[PDB]
C-alpha cells in the first residue's frame, strides 16, 4: 500500500543465472524498508520465492521520499549459493564465516613458518 517497489534498470544476465535490477522503493512516511520486506515484495512482483532474492546497497534520498538499492533474482538457490558474495549469503544465513581474526591467522602462519614437517600441524 504505502510502500511501493519499481525496478528501473533490468537485465536478464544469462551469464550469472540471475536477473539484476535497481530497486526504487517509495516509503513516503516510514523508515527505510527492511531488506526482508523488499525481498518479499520483489518475490510477489516477479512470481518467484523470497530465498533467491538478494538485495543490497539501499540509500535513502534526502527528505525521506524514496530509497534506492540493487536486487538480484537467481534462477535457483543453487545458482544463488554459487554466484553470490559470501557476506550476502551470510545475511540470509546460508554462510558462516571463520571465527578467528586476521591477527590470529597471521601469527599462527608465522609460528608454523618456524617448524618443519608434520610438526607444523601442532601449533596453536
Amino acid at each position: 500500500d504505502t510502500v511501493t517497489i519499481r525496478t528501473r534498470k533490468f537485465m536478464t544476465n544469462r551469464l550469472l543465472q540471475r536477473k539484476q535490477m535497481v530497486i526504487d522503493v517509495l516509503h513516503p512516511g516510514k523508515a527505510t524498508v527492511p531488506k526482508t520486506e523488499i525481498r518479499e515484495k520483489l518475490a510477489k512482483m516477479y512470481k518467484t520465492t523470497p530465498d533467491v532474492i538478494f538485495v543490497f546497497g539501499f540509500r535513502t534520498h534526502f527528505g525521506g521520499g524514496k530509497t534506492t538499492g540493487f536486487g538480484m533474482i537467481y534462477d535457483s538457490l543453487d545458482y544463488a549459493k554459487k554466484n553470490e558474495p559470501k557476506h550476502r549469503l551470510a545475511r540470509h544465513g546460508l554462510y558462516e564465516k571463520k571465527k578467528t581474526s586476521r591477527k590470529q591467522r597471521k601469527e599462527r602462519k608465522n609460528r608454523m613458518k618456524k617448524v618443519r614437517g608434520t610438526a607444523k600441524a601442532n601449533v596453536g
Binding site: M11, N13, R14, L15, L16, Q20, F70, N83, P85
Partner: protein
C-alpha cells in the same frame, strides 16, 4: 625498476577505457597478448564497465571461468585478456556477438554484430618475410603468423581471416580510393576514403583521408587500417559511420533530440 611491472595505476590507465577515479587505486593491468597495452580493452572492462553483466571483478572472473566468452572463436578465461581492434567477442550463452570497433571519440564502442559476420575478422598485415625453405609468412596486427599467403598481399594491406580456420579468404590492397579507418592519433575512430599517401623516406609516411561528408584529415601510415574496397566496408560500422561530429553539431543533435524527447 627490476624486471617487468605488473600493476597499472588507475590514472595511468588509457583514457579510452572510460575508467573513473574513486573506484580504486589500480586499473586492470592488461595481460600480455595480441594487442598493445594502450590499444586494447581488458575483458574485465568490457564485461563489467561496458556490458554491465557483472558488478565486480569477482563476478567477471566467475563469468570468464564458466567459459562463456570466446574472443576470436577461442575461449579465454583471463579477465585482463587484451581484446583489441577488430576482435570478435562471442557469448553463446546469451547468443550475442560484438566486434571491437573504435568509436568516433577514440573508444571501443559496444558494437553488436550478426552471427554470420562473427565468423570472420579483418587483420592489417604488419610484416611479410620469406623464411625457412622459402615459405612466405605474414604477420598482422593480431600478432598471428600466417604461412603461405597470397603473393599479391603486401604490407599495409588488410586480409580477411576466417576465425574458425585462421586462413585468409580475401584481401584488400592499400590503394587510393579504398575505405579506411584510423586506429590511432587525433583522428582515431574516423572512417573515410584514402585520397593520397605522401611518402617521406626514412620517416613516417602520411596518409590523407576524406570523410564521407567531405571532411579531409591526415594521419600517419601506421594509424591507417583499410576497411573495405572502394567505399564499401567489409565489416559493419557503429551507429556513427566513422564521421566525427564537431562539438557544435553534437550539441545541436542533442538539443534536437531533447526537443522531441519524452
Amino acid at each position: 625498476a627490476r624486471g617487468p611491472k605488473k600493476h597499472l595505476k588507475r590514472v595511468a590507465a588509457p583514457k579510452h577505457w572510460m575508467l573513473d577515479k574513486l573506484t580504486g587505486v589500480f586499473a586492470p593491468r592488461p595481460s600480455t597478448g595480441p594487442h598493445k597495452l594502450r590499444e586494447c580493452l581488458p575483458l574485465i572492462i568490457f564485461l563489467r564497465n561496458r556490458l554491465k553483466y557483472a558488478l565486480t571483478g569477482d563476478e567477471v572472473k566467475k563469468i570468464c571461468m564458466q567459459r562463456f566468452i570466446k574472443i576470436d572463436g577461442k575461449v579465454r578465461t583471463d579477465i585482463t585478456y587484451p581484446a583489441g581492434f577488430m576482435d570478435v567477442i562471442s557469448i553463446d550463452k546469451t547468443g550475442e556477438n560484438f566486434r571491437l570497433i573504435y568509436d568516433t571519440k577514440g573508444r571501443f564502442a559496444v558494437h553488436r554484430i550478426t552471427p554470420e559476420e562473427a565468423k570472420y575478422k579483418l587483420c592489417k598485415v604488419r610484416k611479410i618475410f620469406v623464411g625457412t625453405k622459402g615459405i612466405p609468412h605474414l604477420v598482422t596486427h593480431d600478432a598471428r603468423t600466417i604461412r603461405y599467403p597470397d603473393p599479391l598481399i603486401k604490407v599495409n594491406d588488410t586480409i580477411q581471416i576466417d576465425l574458425e580456420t585462421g586462413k585468409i579468404t580475401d584481401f584488400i590492397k592499400f590503394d587510393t580510393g579504398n575505405l579506411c579507418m584510423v586506429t590511432g592519433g587525433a583522428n582515431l575512430g574516423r572512417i573515410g576514403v584514402i585520397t593520397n599517401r605522401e611518402r617521406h623516406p626514412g620517416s613516417f609516411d602520411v596518409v590523407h583521408v576524406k570523410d564521407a561528408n567531405g571532411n579531409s584529415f591526415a594521419t600517419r601510415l601506421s594509424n591507417i587500417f583499410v576497411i573495405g574496397k572502394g567505399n564499401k566496408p567489409w565489416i559493419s560500422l557503429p551507429r556513427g559511420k566513422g564521421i566525427r561530429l564537431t562539438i557544435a553539431e553534437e550539441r545541436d543533435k542533442r538539443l534536437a533530440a531533447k526537443q522531441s524527447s519524452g
